[PDB]
From Swiss-Prot, chains A, B, C, D, E:
Highest rank taxon of the organism: Viruses
Gene3D superfamilies, A to Z: Rotavirus NSP2 fragment, C-terminal domain, Rotavirus NSP2 fragment, N-terminal domain
Subunit description: Homooctamer. Interacts with VP1; this interaction is weak. Interacts with NSP5; this interaction leads to up-regulation of NSP5 phosphorylation and formation of viral factories. Interacts with host DCP1A, DCP1B, DDX6, EDC4 and EIF2S1/eIF2-alpha; these interactions are probably part of the sequestration of some host SGs and PBs proteins in viral factories.
Organism: Rotavirus A (strain RVA/SA11-Ramig/G3P[X]) (RV-A)
Role this protein plays: Participates in replication and packaging of the viral genome. Plays a crucial role, together with NSP5, in the formation of virus factories (viroplasms), which are large inclusions in the host cytoplasm where replication intermediates are assembled and viral RNA replication takes place. Displays ssRNA binding, NTPase, RNA triphosphatase (RTPase) and ATP-independent helix-unwinding activities. The unwinding activity may prepare and organize plus-strand RNAs for packaging and replication by removing interfering secondary structures.
Name listed for the protein in its UniProt record: Non-structural protein 2
GO CC entries: host cell cytoplasm
Record's keyword terms, sorted: ATP-binding, Host cytoplasm, Hydrolase, Magnesium, Metal-binding, Nucleotide-binding, RNA-binding
UniProt cross-references to SUPFAM superfamilies, sorted A to Z: Rotavirus NSP2 fragment, C-terminal domain, Rotavirus NSP2 fragment, N-terminal domain
Amino acid sequence: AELACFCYPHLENDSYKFIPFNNLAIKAMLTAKVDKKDMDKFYDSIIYGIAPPPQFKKRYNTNDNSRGMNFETIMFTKVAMLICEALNSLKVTQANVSNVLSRVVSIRHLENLVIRKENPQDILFHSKDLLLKSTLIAIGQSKEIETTITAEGGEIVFQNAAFTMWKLTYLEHQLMPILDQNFIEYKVTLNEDKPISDVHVKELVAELRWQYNKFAVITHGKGHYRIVKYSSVANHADRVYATFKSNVKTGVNNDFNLLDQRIIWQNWYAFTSSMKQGNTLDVCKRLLFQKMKPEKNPFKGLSTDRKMDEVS
Amino acid sequence: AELACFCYPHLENDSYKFIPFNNLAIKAMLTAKVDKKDMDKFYDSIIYGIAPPPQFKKRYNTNDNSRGMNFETIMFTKVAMLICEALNSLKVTQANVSNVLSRVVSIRHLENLVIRKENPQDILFHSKDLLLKSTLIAIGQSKEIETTITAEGGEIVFQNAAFTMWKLTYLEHQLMPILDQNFIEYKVTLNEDKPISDVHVKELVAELRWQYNKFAVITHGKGHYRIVKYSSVANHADRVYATFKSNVKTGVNNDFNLLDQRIIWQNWYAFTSSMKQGNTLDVCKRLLFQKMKPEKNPFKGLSTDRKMDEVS
Amino acid sequence: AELACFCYPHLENDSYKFIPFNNLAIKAMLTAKVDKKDMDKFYDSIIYGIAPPPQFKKRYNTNDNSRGMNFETIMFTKVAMLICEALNSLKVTQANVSNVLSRVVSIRHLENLVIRKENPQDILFHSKDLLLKSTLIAIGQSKEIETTITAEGGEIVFQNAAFTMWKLTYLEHQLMPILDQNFIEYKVTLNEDKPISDVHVKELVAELRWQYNKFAVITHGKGHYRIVKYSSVANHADRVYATFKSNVKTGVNNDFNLLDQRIIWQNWYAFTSSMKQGNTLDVCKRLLFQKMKPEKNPFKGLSTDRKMDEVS
Amino acid sequence: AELACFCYPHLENDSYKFIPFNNLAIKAMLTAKVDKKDMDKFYDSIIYGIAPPPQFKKRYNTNDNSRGMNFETIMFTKVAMLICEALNSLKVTQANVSNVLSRVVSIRHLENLVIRKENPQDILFHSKDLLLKSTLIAIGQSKEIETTITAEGGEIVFQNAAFTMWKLTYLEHQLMPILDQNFIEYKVTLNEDKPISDVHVKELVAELRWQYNKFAVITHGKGHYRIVKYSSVANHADRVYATFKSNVKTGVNNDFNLLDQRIIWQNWYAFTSSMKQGNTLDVCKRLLFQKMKPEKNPFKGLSTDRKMDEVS
Amino acid sequence: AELACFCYPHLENDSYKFIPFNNLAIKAMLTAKVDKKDMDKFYDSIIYGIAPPPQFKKRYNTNDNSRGMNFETIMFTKVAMLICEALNSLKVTQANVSNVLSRVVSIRHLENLVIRKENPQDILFHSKDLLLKSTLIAIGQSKEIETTITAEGGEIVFQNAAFTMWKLTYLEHQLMPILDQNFIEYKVTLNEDKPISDVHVKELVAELRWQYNKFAVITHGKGHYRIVKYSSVANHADRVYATFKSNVKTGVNNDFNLLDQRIIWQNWYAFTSSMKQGNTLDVCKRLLFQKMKPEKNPFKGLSTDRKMDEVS
Ligand SMILES: [Cl-]
Ligand SMILES: [Cl-]
Ligand SMILES: [Cl-]
Ligand SMILES: [Cl-]
Ligand SMILES: [Cl-]
Ligand code: NA
């Protein structure tokens, strides 16, 4: 959803402050009769303060909508506040305010950051610097790459010197949970920006082959691995191409990190490489469904080793 | 119930302070044997402080009474405090204290204000000024008219630039809930920001005809619309007439605002107009039960009437 | 779903007997690996008897399917038995068996018949003749029209000499409930095959206008009225045209009863008339969205009468 | 309610057989549009058999009515069957059928009889003769007086050679419970129709004065004592007088048994005596509220004896 | 129990400070092996501080004892603190220190004072002086008579200018509840220890005769009325005489206030009068069981007046 679904701008001095919507203001807006010309304008609930532009009605869950967010939960407020705190640190100017608020982001990523931030065990709880950096990355206001330290979060299920693997517990989210109960997804973030040894790569690949054999190892080009069911790959390709195409259109920074060819699923590496080369969706995407000549396996015997390890 | 059911006066210098009753003081009063001459006097429970005059026993729910209020709930205390705060701002004098305390008010309206006041999302939570105004209107100590901003509240089910429609949550009340489970009633308050446009009048009437076709649009003359089941119209008629009649008997001025003839149910407009002309209840109600086709042109003859006035 | 989802044929004498599937046989079939050539063949679970052809997998709810039926409920067995009892009375021959089982029917209609049949208050409980007739109508093996006596059932919400109105309680079904919690639908069946007086029509129309103003009065041409939300009409038109088109294709009896033009929604009568006249979907369907010149209202003042009735 | 609210007559051979209504038939009738002239006729639900005449609608509890009976409970069916069994033993004639069913009876009395007859400890369980007799008395088809053996029932709280005292547990009833939670009432039936010794009368009076001092001892003239709160006495006077008047008007002999003047409350004896003498309600009632000079009581110091027994 | 069951003395400066036992110190003491010589010495649990003298073991509930107090409840600690607060205000010296802790008091009376004290509605909550007075009276360290203001507490069930009647809720107590579920007792305290008008006495007697006719009105001579079941009177007599006899033998003054003969049960008045005259238990107590010549009824017709009030 757009950042504009959570907060509205308020001019103080030369700079804009951002304020969370009250959930009852949103609720009022959803029952409102509004002229077409005012669909893109902030809404006055009268009793509960300002509400988001009515054009965003479908971002919110109601009796007849389950494709939006549960804005009446406490997590909505927590996420809104997370966003506001980050935006407030930016000193957004008159010129940029609309651009900033129109950015569409992952709400689940933000709920996960709230979960990190509120846990006294977690570094984000103790470092406002890292919390802000992590949030800025999540709301499209940073050039920095998401790494282990700034990761959205979840449950750590594997870790070595170079990598941290997280289970994304989207089924249990309050604000915008995944509704398909068969959903399972992980991400692998890089611990440091530093050359990674063959040994540490091998360790990750061995874990992925043994423990997550039914998962494709892919990436959306933003600097981390996404571990997804093979049955979901086509959808990921659609999302990835569209984002890439759009960035080419708006001339926005369209840097796409392919990541390690020894780790990424062979077909996905082919699909994304062809995409970067400037091919159309159809040329790209069909590479996903093709059985390819198995590349020179950089790490033979990995699964057998894990197997023998388990037996002993 | 009378305001004297919630608090008692204490003279301090030149004006009164009002103090809420302890619920156990009321409970003791209910078991008390009192001289007839003392039925109208505030009661000393000895252990729990002053209590309301025994003449108001029937205002309180007991084993042999379910037609009063639940004075042992926390809401009783909250409503009593709301009343006291408003009354304390008035500087009530000896000349007026009896009249003030004898004013009968809607307890449900007051519970609804407590509900608004205690919600951080609601402007009443943040504006002592508006809270006082809203309360003063509710307890009959204001010249002001209830509007959206000063409304008793409830659930907003429709809103446009000119109007806010509220569902009244009376079934869920703690202090004096409606006990008939078939109860459904709404109210429409004017936002009163700017002059009203007929665009917004048409929108309201369309919502009412389409979504609430089984409800009569009426008013009790206090400046807002009441959306009631047609099957409850006769009862509202009786209540409205009694209040009107009583104000005539006593001497209080009857300000009955008829509102918009295009919005009010035609029969209700006729009934209230006849009432305002001093007709008996029997004559007024006949209009309620009469089949009646809408008035084409209520403004026809306005100039001719002015003409004949000049001739006279 | 197809009748073939509930039972399989077994040759006894010259005639076919029909036997319900065990739900664990179906469950086994859903986990089975089957050759393309055998998708249309009955499945042998080995342990739990015969199961339906694997081509019907999507008729059954599983972890990854919510668009089918809950075949593990007792209602599945009850419906299967209802079907078998009716089919067994037919003495289906070798030639017809495949045709009979391929018929797609409403499962909810059948669950409703089970609910009627199992209620000792209901005539279907006491008359095997009427139960069989009702079931045959429901499974496409009868020329008879569904009437009040043979109705699928539900809750009676209105009745007069000529009509019976039923609420379809699909939200509460066990086998294949409607999942959209906003669903509401009724049907009006004719009590007798006998001319209906203007008075009795007027009574129905008055009820529909007063109590169900937000519902379109339509029909699928099979001899009864369907009372559906206006917001669902376009979908009904799609379903109705497809069925009509298909029947023209297979040369199947394509009799479409328009029903009473004084009762049916004006636009729906236009749409279905144009359909019968042989027009395309686009010519037909667009009549639904057009505001038409209100036809000569056969019953003026109906809503006003009900209104005045309620007030008194 | 009238007997016609529970069953309808069906002519078999020589005479009428009474058959209980299905509760869904009643439920259908409540939704039915019926011609004015047919309001007093038995209603055909089509689906669920015959229903009571629509003129009796208010006898049945619905969403908008709480003053009737809960006809969807199993007790409705049990009461109906009890009525039917009694009526079917009478061989009612054509000339009598309508009057028999028009009789208004106590539904609570009937539920109590059901409670008696279904209890294997109770004599009514083991004697169809006594059961029929008890029921015929309750439904106004007997010249017999209700005694202990044929009592409606309840809980026995006192018993001696001559009397049995019952607590009427109307609060716990399923069909038509008393809704006032403050309700308490007892009845004292005579164990047999014989002269009662002074000693056995004195024993009853002693118990009433000691254990039930806040209760008036009255009678409705049907041969037993009713023990009711003094605060309900005036209401009993209204009901009793109303019934007495009704009988005199319709030429029915009241046969009002005053009962023992040594037991009945003095003011009640005066009231009913004045009623039998033919006086107006106003004149009779005036005797209820008259602090009349005590008659000397024929049982001195009964409470003193009980006190001393308690202390020992 | 003895005050020494709740606290121990600690000399501080000129006088003793009293300190509550930890419940685990008591629990330890209950398992302790102690010399007979030390049974009357305070016990050192080592772990949980000082404990009561082992001679008081039976005052505490354990697996083999249910006749004591529940010392592990929070009410134990509250009562203990209530006692200490009162004793500490006395500046007890070596002179009286031992007699103070030996005094046996009503634990239930003390729990009731805690219940009064902790209630913001109660005057004891706001006045430390009245709280101390009330407690000092309850623990036998005051010459003042218990009145309404200083009452132990309970539920107010009647009140007039002169009296307050309390229900003792001993069944619900935590520390040492009455275990006989048949228990019911009230007390009537004087609002002021001043002469009381005949009218105000009459009001009390009328309430007692009407609402509490099965209760004997007695007193234990300490300045208030106790309303007890007639079946408990003989036991009260034994307790009262034993205390009187004991006070005589222990030099302590009796000061038995017989209270008002127009209120007290005749037999109790005779018994206690005879007691005050120095007669033996046999002579005193037999007056309880004698049917006495009725005394001139001071207020004839009280019962009739209430009856008439109830009927109207
Ligand atoms: Cl990525
Ligand atoms: Cl109003
Ligand atoms: Cl149809
Ligand atoms: Cl009687
Ligand atoms: Cl005492
Ligand atoms: Na009828």
